[PDB]
Design a protein around this ligand. Structure first.
Ligand SMILES: *[C@@H]1O[C@H](CO)[C@@H](O[C@@H]2O[C@H](CO)[C@@H](O[C@@H]3O[C@H](CO[C@H]4O[C@H](CO[C@H]5O[C@H](CO)[C@@H](O)[C@H](O)[C@@H]5O)[C@@H](O)[C@H](O[C@H]5O[C@H](CO)[C@@H](O)[C@H](O)[C@@H]5O)[C@@H]4O)[C@@H](O)[C@H](O[C@H]4O[C@H](CO)[C@@H](O)[C@H](O)[C@@H]4O)[C@@H]3O)[C@H](O)[C@H]2NC(C)=O)[C@H](O)[C@H]1NC(C)=O
Ligand SMILES: *[C@@H]1O[C@H](CO)[C@@H](O[C@@H]2O[C@H](CO)[C@@H](O[C@@H]3O[C@H](CO[C@H]4O[C@H](CO[C@H]5O[C@H](CO)[C@@H](O)[C@H](O)[C@@H]5O)[C@@H](O)[C@H](O[C@H]5O[C@H](CO)[C@@H](O)[C@H](O)[C@@H]5O)[C@@H]4O)[C@@H](O)[C@H](O[C@H]4O[C@H](CO)[C@@H](O)[C@H](O)[C@@H]4O)[C@@H]3O)[C@H](O)[C@H]2NC(C)=O)[C@H](O)[C@H]1NC(C)=O
Ligand SMILES: *[C@@H]1O[C@H](CO)[C@@H](O[C@@H]2O[C@H](CO)[C@@H](O[C@@H]3O[C@H](CO[C@H]4O[C@H](CO[C@H]5O[C@H](CO)[C@@H](O)[C@H](O)[C@@H]5O)[C@@H](O)[C@H](O[C@H]5O[C@H](CO)[C@@H](O)[C@H](O)[C@@H]5O)[C@@H]4O)[C@@H](O)[C@H](O[C@H]4O[C@H](CO)[C@@H](O)[C@H](O)[C@@H]4O)[C@@H]3O)[C@H](O)[C@H]2NC(C)=O)[C@H](O)[C@H]1NC(C)=O
Ligand SMILES: *[C@@H]1O[C@H](CO)[C@@H](O[C@@H]2O[C@H](CO)[C@@H](O)[C@H](O)[C@H]2NC(C)=O)[C@H](O)[C@H]1NC(C)=O
Ligand SMILES: *[C@@H]1O[C@H](CO)[C@@H](O[C@@H]2O[C@H](CO)[C@@H](O)[C@H](O)[C@H]2NC(C)=O)[C@H](O)[C@H]1NC(C)=O
Ligand SMILES: *[C@@H]1O[C@H](CO)[C@@H](O[C@@H]2O[C@H](CO)[C@@H](O)[C@H](O)[C@H]2NC(C)=O)[C@H](O)[C@H]1NC(C)=O
Lengths: 129, 105, 336, 105, 336, 105, 336, 129, 129
C-alpha cells in the first residue's frame, strides 16, 4: 500500500524551469533517502540527484550539477526536484525512489537504484519549443 | 532467486535478501568519532606538540581502517556461510514433504 | 533445489577463508573531491570571530580595535582560516616580535568568548604615574575621535615633574573573569624615535618589560627609532611603533607585568570557557554540508567509508579506509 | 539439559556448560594496561601537552572498547554455533546405537 | 533428541550473524558509583610526600621548611591531591610569580625522591660576597631558633665595605646527584621595602635574576615595597617577600644562575629517579581497593568490564566499555 | 595425507596443503607502519612531549599486537574448520561413486 | 575415508573456540638479539651530517667550523648517535648555558639541510658599529690563517671613538631561505676577563642579550672572568669564552636579536626542509640490514613477527607481538 | 568430596554481633571468590557479601554495607563473615558458596549464585530478645 | 620442470675456501628466499645459511657465522654460498632449496626445509689434507 507519486511534469520550452514533486502515501519519508532518476525510451534508467535523510545532496551524474536542485519537507512528506535551464536532451520520464536500506544514505546511482524498494510511476518531462 | 526444479521459494529468496540488507545497514550506521585540531596548541609556538598530534591522528586512522575492514570481512563471512545454510534448509524441506518413498541423490 | 546467480566472479575478502569469488558485490567506498568549505549541518560554524563587526579582521577584534567590539557568538565548531592573522587598522604593530598573531586562533579554540566590561586595573594611577591615557588618529572611534585598542591603555606620564626615567615597576594583573573561565590579558609597549621618546616619557634609552603568569615568563627590550615600515595599520604616518603580547591567566590566578616607560597597560580582558572543535579551512562558507574535511572541504556522506587523503574532519563524515571495501551480495561463484 | 525422548545425556549437558564456562573465564582474565597521568607534564605549565594526552586516552579507551566487544561477539558466535554441534553429535549417537532397522525422520 | 531451554528471548550480538535471540545471558558489566579514594591493594600509595613530617604540607617539604625534613618513602603509585599546593609556614612567598607550586607535583612523579645531604655550592664565599646566611623568626628550627628553608641560603652581605650595588653575578650550579637521577635545584630571591633594602644590601632599586639549565632560561625582576598581603606563611609580620623557583638539571648537567642583591642561593637539592604512576585523587585514603579511578575513587573489580565515565585509573581495574555487554548462556530462541 | 581405505586422494591432500600455505603467505605479507622519533622534539628541551610520545608508542604496539594475534586466531579458525569441510567432501565422493547398493556406517 | 596425522598434540588458539590441540604448528615469531647498527637496505642512512668533512663532529659542522663546511647529503633516514653532541675545535664554548648542543640533532630531523651562501645581515655596518670582524688562532682556516665559525661574525668595535658601552641594540634577522624551508639562525656572544673586555669593547660590565622568533623569546646575561676550563675546543689558551644559541625562524618570518658588546652576529644560516625518520643508534654502521631497531640494532626479517623488547624501528621490520604465535598446520588431535 | 561447612550461627539479641565461618575441605580457597547468601523461609535466597580472590569486598545488597564485614585466611582455608548490630529481620539461614568460574571475581548476587559449584549446608542465625 | 642445480663442490684442504653455486632452471629466483643445507651421512640434514628476497642474510646455525657468506644475482638467476676457513667437519653434501611460501622470508632451518618445494640434487664438499 506504500506508494510514491510523482507529479509536475509536462511540456516546457528550452531554458525553462520545472518543479517535480514526489509525494509518499502509506509511509513517511523521515529517515529515508529519496533519489531521482530519469529514462529516455530505449536507454537504461540513469540517476539524477538524491537527498539523504539529513537533507544533504548527492549528485548521481556530473552534468546536472547546478541546474538540478532538491529539497525535502518532513511535514509535507514530499520531496521536490527543481530543474532550471532545461535542455531538449532533458526530455525523459522522471522517477523518484526510496528505501530503508543503506542507512538513509544516497550511495551512487547504480547502488541506490538496486537498493530502492519503492518507485513512483514516473512523470513525463518534455523540453521543446 | 531460491527455488526448486521450475518454481521459486519466495521466503527463502526473501530472507537471503534481508540478511544482506541487515549487514549493509549495520555497516552503514557505525559511529566513529572524528579527529580535529588541539584547541590549545598554536602553530609556530607548539610545533613539537603538533607533530605528535599528527602522529596520533595517523596511527588512529590506521587502527580504525583495520577495524572496519575486519567488520566487512566478518560480514562477508556470514553472508558466504549463509549460502550453505539456505541450501541445507532447502534440502530439509524437500526431504520432509517428499516422503521416504523418494531417495536423495 | 538451488539458488540462481549472475554467473560472474567478483572477489571479496573474508575473515577466516581469505579471498573468495562471489556472484555480486556492493562497493562501500568513494573517493571524495576537493571543493569549498561550508556551514556544518546542525551547527553554527564560526569563521570570523565577530561577523557583524564589519571591515574588521579577527586580530582587529582580538585587540579591541575601535569599531571592532561587540558580542562574539558561541560556537561548538570553528574554522581556522588564517594561519597568520593580520590587522587592518589602528596603530602600527611590529607583529612578529611576539606571539600576538595567534591570539584570535587561541580564542577560537574556546566555545564561549567575551571581552570583559570592567577594566582589570586602573591605568591612570598605576605605578610610575600618574598617567594620561594616550589616543591616536590611527584609531578613530565611533564618532571619529582619536582612540586606542580597548584591551590596553597607553600610559603617558601626565606631569613633567614625574616625566623621568624609571626603575622597573611591577603591577599585579588580577583575575576578573568568572570561575571556570580562562583570562587572556593583552598588553604591550609603545616606542618611538629618540626625540619623541624624550618628549613623551623623559627617557630615550631602550625600555625593558617582563610578564609572568602561571609560571610562564617573557622578557622584551624595546627599540629606539629605525623601525620597519608601517603595515596592516590605519594608513596614517607615525614615528613610533607598539609591541603587543598576551598572557593566559589560568584557574583564577594573578599575573604580573614589570615595565618602564611606554607601557600599554591591560584594560579590557578576554574571558573564555568551553572548547570549540577546530579544523583548518577557508572562507567564505558556501552553503552547508554533512562534513567538513581539511583536504576536501565540505562534503556529504554518500557512503559510510571513503578512500583517499585522510585528514582532520568534523561532523557526519564518511570514515577513512585503506582499500575500496566491498560487501558480498551473492553466492559462491562456480564456473558454468 | 541435553537428552532424548525422557532421559538426559549427562556428558553432553555437562560439556555445553563447560564451553560457556571457558568463555566466561577467558573474558574474565584479559589483561589490559591502564592509563595514568604523565609524570612530567604539569598543570598550567603544560596544558597543550595535557590536552593531547587527554585525546590519546579518549582514543585508546574507544579502541579497547571495540576490541573487547568483538571478543564477546566472537565468544557468542562460538557458543551459538556449538548448539548445532551438540545436536549433530546427539543425532550421530542415536544413529549408531539404533541400527539400520530404524529410520531417521 | 534435543536440548531444553528457558523459552524466553534475550538478544545478544555475534561477530558474523548480527543480533540473535538466545535462551539466557550473563551480563559482563556494571556501572560503578563514586566514593572516597583508598590505598591501592598491593602497593604503598603515596599521598603526602613525607607523612611522618607532621603539620607540614607537600610544598613545605619540597622547600625544606624547618621541622619538615626527613626521608621521602619511595612509591610506584602516587595521588595528586593538590592541583595548587600551598605552604603553611616559614617566610612569606609570592607563590604565583613562578612555577614553584608545581614542585611537589613534579617530585611525586618520580618513584625515588631524596634531599641531598651536601650543599651544592658554598653560599658564604659565593660571588658578590662574602655573605652571612640570613635566618628568620618566621622559620623556627628544631630548638625554636631562627632558621630558613633547607634548600636555600639567604645571602646577605657580611661587610659594609662590600655592601653595595652589584653588576649581575654568575654562579655555576653543579650536578651532585647520582648518575641516572634528575636534580631539581631550588633557588630564589628576597626583596623588601626601600629603606630595608638599603640597610640589608646597600641598594634599593629592583634586582634582576636569570636561571639557565638544559637550554631552559628564565628571567625575573624584583619588586620594591607595596607587596601583597602575607599568606600561607609563619604568621609573623615581615616587610619583605621572597620569590622562589626551581630548575631541573637533567643528565648530569650544570646549571647557571645570574643574580644581584637578595639572592637565595641553592643549598640542599632534590635527587629523583624512576617513575611513579600518578592519578588525581583526594586525601584521606580510607581502607584499600583493587583499583583507583579518577572519577569513582577506590573500587573493587566485581566484573571484568564497566560502563560509565571512563577516566585514568591504576591497579586491578575493570575495563571501560561502551555498551553493557552480555555473554550468551543458552540456545537459539524459538517461539513455543 | 587424505585418502581412502589404502589409497591417497592427491587433490584433497594437495588443496589442504595450499589452504595452510595461503594463510601463511597472507600473514607473512601484512604491512604495518613502524614507529620512529619525533623529528622536532629534542631531548632535555621537550622531555614532557617525549614522555607522551613514549606512551603513544606503547599503546600502539599493544594495539597492533592484539590485532595480529586475532589475525592468527582467525587463520587457525579457518584451518581447523577446513578439516570438517575436507572430510565432508571426501564422504560425498564415496557416496556418489558407491551407488545406493552400499550403505554408509 | 580420512586424513592421516602425526598423532601428537600442539595447542593453538582460535577466534571462537578457544584453545584447540592440533597435529602440527608453524611458529611465527623469533626473539632477536642485539648487535651493531647498519645501513638500512634501500636507503642512504645518515650518521654524520657531513661524512666527507674529515675530523669534524656534527656540532662542528652545525656551527660552521673552518674546514668543516660542505654539502650535507639529503637523507630520508637518520641515526641519532650523540645524545649530547660535542665540538672538537675552534673557539671555546660554554655549551651547556644554552640549547646549542641539540642543534645538529634538530638538523638531522630534516631530509634536506644546507648552509646558506649569503650572509643574512651585514656585520660590519650593524647597529652599534662599525665593526671589524674578529678571528682567532683557535679556528685555523683552509690556509691556516685565523678564522671563525662561518655561521657567525665576531663583532668588535673598529674605532676607539665608538669603543664605548652601548644601550641594547636591536637587529632584524630576515628570512633568506626558500619558501617552505625552515631557517635556523646561529648567534651568540663573546665575553672575556675585565681588562680584555675594556680593551676590546670599552666596557667591562656584564652584557645582556635577547632573541625573539615566532613568539619564542630568550634572555642571556654574560659572565666577566672566572670562566670554566676550556673544553672541546682548538686546544689553544684563551682568556675569553663564547656562548652560542640558535633560533628557528618558521614560515618566512623575521626574527630579532637585542644585544650589547661582544655580539656574535649571524652570517651563514641553515635552510632545511622535509622530514627524516630518526631513531637512536650508534656509529659505525657495519654492513646493511632489513631493519634498524633501537634495542637490537640492525636485524633481518626472518619471520613476520618478533617477541622481546619493543622499540622504535625503521625499515622492513618484523612486527612486535606479545606472545609466540603459532599457525595451525594439521588436524584436530584425538588420542590414539 | 569437596565441601564447604558453615558454623557460628545461633541465637543472638538485637544489636548483638556474630561471626560466621566458612571452612573448606577437599579443596583450597586460594584463587577463588567466596560469597555469602541468606534465605528467609518462604523467600528466595538473597546475596549478602562476597570476597574476591584478591581479598576485596563486593556487597550484594546495599542495606548490609557497614554492618557486615568479611575476611579470608589462606592459611586457615577459611572465610569469615562478621555481622554487627544485628536486627530481627537478619534472622535467616546463612550460606557460603564458591566456584572456579568467573576469574575469581564476585560478580553480583544473581550471577554468582548461578556460578556457584559448591554450597555449604547453611547455619541458622536467629535474632531475638 | 623447475629445477635447482648445485655445483662447485669438490676436494679442498683445511683452511681452504670454496664457492658453491645454485642455478635455477624453469623458474626465476626473484621474490624467493634460497636456503643452503648440508647433510652428513647418517645424520639429519641441517641448515646453514639463507638469503631472503630482499638480499638479507639469515644464519640457520650459530657456528657458521663469519665463515659462510651468501649472495644472489637476479640477472644470473643464481645464488652463491662462499665458504672460507673450511674444517674437516664441514665435509658433507650441500643442498640449496627454495619455495614461494612464507613471503620470501628465510624463517629458520626447520621451518624453511619443510616449506621448500624445490631441492637441488646436492654437491659433495670434502675437506681433507
Ligand atoms: C551537500 O549538500 C548540501 C545540501 O545540504 C549542498 O548545499 C547546496 O549547495 C548548492 C551548491 O552550492 C547551493 O546552491 C546555490 O544556491 C544559491 C542560493 O542559496 C540560497 O538559496 C537557497 C534556495 O533556498 C530557497 O528555496 C528554499 C526551498 O527550496 C527555501 O527554504 C529558501 O528559504 C529559499 O526560498 C537556500 O537553500 C540557501 O540557503 C543555504 O545557503 C546559505 C548561503 O551560504 C546558507 O547561509 C544557509 O544556511 C543554507 O545553507 C540560500 O538561501 C544560488 O545562488 C546558487 O546559484 C549559483 O550557482 C549555480 C550553480 O551552482 C548557478 O547555476 C546559478 O546561476 C548561480 O550562479 C546555487 O544554486 C545550495 O544553496 C546549497 N544548499 C544548502 C541548503 O546550503 C551541497 O552543495 C552539497 N555538497 C556536495 C559536495 O555535494
Ligand atoms: C573494596 O574492598 C576493600 C577490602 O579489600 C574494602 O575495604 C574495607 O572498607 C571498609 C569500609 O570503609 C572498612 O571498614 C571500616 O573499618 C574501620 C576499621 O579499619 C581498621 O580495622 C579493620 C579491621 O581489622 C581488624 O580485624 C582484622 C581481621 O578481621 C585484622 O586483620 C586487623 O589487624 C584488625 O584486627 C582493618 O581491616 C583496617 O585495615 C585497613 O584499613 C586501614 C585504614 O585505612 C589501612 O591503613 C589498612 O592498610 C587496611 O587497608 C583498619 O585497621 C572501621 O573503623 C569502620 O567502622 C566505621 O564505619 C562503619 C561503616 O562503614 C560504621 O558501622 C562504624 O560504626 C564506624 O563508624 C569500617 O568498618 C575496612 O576496614 C576496609 N578493609 C580494608 C582491608 O581496607 C572496601 O570498602 C571495598 N570498596 C568498595 C567500594 O566496595
Ligand atoms: C643481515 O643481512 C645482511 C646482508 O644484507 C648482512 O650484512 C653482511 O654482514 C656481514 C657480517 O658483518 C658482512 O661481512 C663482512 O664483510 C666485510 C667486507 O665487506 C665488504 O665486502 C663485502 C663483500 O663484497 C665483495 O663481494 C661481492 C660479491 O660477493 C661484491 O658485490 C663486492 O663488490 C665485493 O667484491 C661487501 O658485501 C661489503 O659491502 C657492504 O658493506 C659495506 C661496509 O659497511 C657497506 O658500505 C656496503 O653498503 C655493503 O652493505 C663490503 O664492501 C669483511 O671484511 C668482514 O670480514 C671480517 O669479519 C669476519 C667475521 O664477520 C671475519 O671472518 C674476517 O676475518 C674479518 O675479520 C665480514 O665478512 C657483509 O659484508 C654484510 N653484507 C652486506 C651486503 O652489507 C648482515 O650481517 C645480516 N645481519 C644479521 C643480524 O643477520
Ligand atoms: C572618541 O574620541 C574623542 C576624542 O578622543 C572623545 O572625546 C573626548 O572625550 C573626553 C571625555 O569625555 C573629553 O575630555 C575630551 O575633551 C573629548 N575630546 C574631543 C576632541 O571631543 C570621545 O569621548 C570618544 N568617544 C568614545 C565613545 O570613546
Ligand atoms: C637553630 O637556630 C639557632 C638560632 O639561629 C641556631 O643557634 C645558632 O647557632 C650558631 C652556630 O652554632 C651560633 O653561631 C649562634 O650563636 C646560635 N644562635 C643562637 C641564638 O643560639 C641553632 O644552631 C639552630 N639549630 C639547628 C639544628 O639548625
Ligand atoms: C684565512 O685567514 C687569513 C688570516 O685571517 C686570511 O688572510 C687575510 O685576508 C684578508 C682579506 O683578504 C686580508 O685583509 C688580510 O691581510 C689577510 N691576512 C693574512 C694574515 O693573510 C685569509 O683570507 C683566510 N682565507 C679564507 C679562505 O677565509
Amino acid at each position: 500500500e506504500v506508494q510514491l507519486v510523482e507529479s509536475g511534469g509536462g511540456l516546457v520550452q528550452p531554458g525553462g524551469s520545472l518543479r517535480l514533486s514526489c509525494a509518499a502515501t502509506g509511509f513517511t519519508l523521515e529517515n529515508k533517502a529519496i533519489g531521482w532518476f530519469r529514462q529516455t525510451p530505449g536507454s537504461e534508467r540513469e540517476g539524477v540527484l538524491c537527498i539523504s535523510k539529513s537533507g544533504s545532496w548527492t549528485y548521481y551524474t556530473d552534468s546536472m550539477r547546478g541546474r538540478f536542485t532538491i529539497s525535502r519537507d518532513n511535514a509535507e512528506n514530499t520531496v521536490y526536484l527543481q530543474m532550471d535551464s532545461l535542455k531538449p536532451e532533458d526530455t525523459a520520464v522522471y522517477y523518484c525512489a526510496t528505501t530503508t536500506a543503506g542507512g538513509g544514505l544516497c550511495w551512487d546511482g547504480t547502488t541506490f537504484s538496486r537498493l530502492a524498494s519503492s518507485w513512483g510511476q514516473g512523470t513525463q518531462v518534455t523540453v521543446s519549443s | 532467486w531460491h527455488g526448486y526444479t521450475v518454481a521459486a521459494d519466495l521466503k527463502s529468496t526473501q530472507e537471503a535478501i534481508n540478511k544482506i540488507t541487515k549487514n549493509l545497514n549495520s555497516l552503514s550506521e557505525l559511529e566513529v568519532k572524528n579527529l580535529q585540531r588541539l584547541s590549545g596548541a598554536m602553530d609556530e609556538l607548539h610545533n613539537e606538540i603538533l607533530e605528535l598530534d599528527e602522529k596520533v591522528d595517523d596511527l588512529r586512522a590506521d587502527t580504525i581502517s583495520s577495524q572496519i575492514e575486519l567488520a566487512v570481512l566478518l560480514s562477508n563471512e556470514g553472508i558466504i556461510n549463509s549460502e550453505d545454510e539456505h541450501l541445507l534448509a532447502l534440502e530439509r524441506k524437500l526431504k520432509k514433504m517428499l516422503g521416504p518413498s523418494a531417495v536423495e541423490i | 533445489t538451488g539458488i540462481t546467480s549472475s554467473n560472474s566472479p567478483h572477489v571479496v575478502k573474508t575473515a577466516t577463508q581469505g579471498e573468495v569469488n562471489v556472484t555480486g558485490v556492493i562497493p562501500l567506498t568513494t573517493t571524495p573531491t576537493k571543493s569549498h568549505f561550508a556551514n556544518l549541518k546542525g551547527t553554527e560554524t564560526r569563521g570570523k570571530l565577530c561577523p557583524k563587526c564589519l571591515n574588521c579582521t579577527d586580530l582587529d577584534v582580538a585587540l579591541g580595535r575601535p569599531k571592532c567590539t561587540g558580542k562574539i557568538p558561541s560556537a561548538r565548531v570553528s574554522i581556522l582560516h588564517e594561519v597568520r592573522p593580520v590587522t587592518s587598522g589602528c596603530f602600527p604593530i611590529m607583529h612578529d616580535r611576539t606571539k600576538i598573531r595567534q591570539l584570535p586562533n587561541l580564542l577560537r579554540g574556546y566555545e564561549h568568548i567575551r571581552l570583559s566590561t570592567h577594566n582589570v586595573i586602573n591605568a591612570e594611577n598605576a605605578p610610575g604615574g600618574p598617567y594620561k591615557i594616550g589616543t591616536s588618529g590611527s584609531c578613530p572611534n565611533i564618532t571619529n575621535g582619536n582612540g586606542f585598542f580597548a584591551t590596553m591603555a597607553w600610559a603617558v606620564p601626565k606631569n613633567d615633574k614625574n616625566k623621568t626615567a624609571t626603575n622597573p615597576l611591577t603591577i599585579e594583573v588580577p583575575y576578573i573573569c568568572t570561575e571556570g573561565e580562562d583570562q587572556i590579558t593583552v598588553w604591550g609597549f609603545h616606542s618611538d624615535n629618540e626625540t619623541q621618546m624624550a618628549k613623551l616619557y623623559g627617557d630615550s634609552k631602550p625600555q625593558k618589560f617582563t610578564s609572568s603568569a602561571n609560571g610562564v615568563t617573557t622578557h622584551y627590550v624595546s627599540q629606539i627609532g629605525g623601525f620597519p615600515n608601517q603595515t596592516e595599520d590605519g594608513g596614517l604616518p607615525q614615528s613610533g611603533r607598539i609591541v603587543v603580547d598576551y598572557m593566559v591567566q589560568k584557574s583564577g590566578k594573578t599575573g604580573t607585568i614589570t615595565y618602564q616607560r611606554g607601557i600599554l597597560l591591560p584594560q579590557k580582558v578576554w574571558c573564555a570557557s568551553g572548547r570549540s572543535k577546530v579544523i583548518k579551512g577557508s572562507l567564505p562558507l558556501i552553503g552547508e554540508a554533512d562534513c567538513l574535511h581539511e583536504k576536501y572541504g565540505g562534503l556529504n556522506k554518500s557512503k559510510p567509508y571513503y578512500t583517499g587523503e585522510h585528514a582532520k574532519a568534523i561532523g557526519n563524515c564518511p570514515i577513512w579506509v585503506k582499500t575500496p571495501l566491498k560487501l558480498a551480495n551473492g553466492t559462491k561463484y562456480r564456473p558454468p
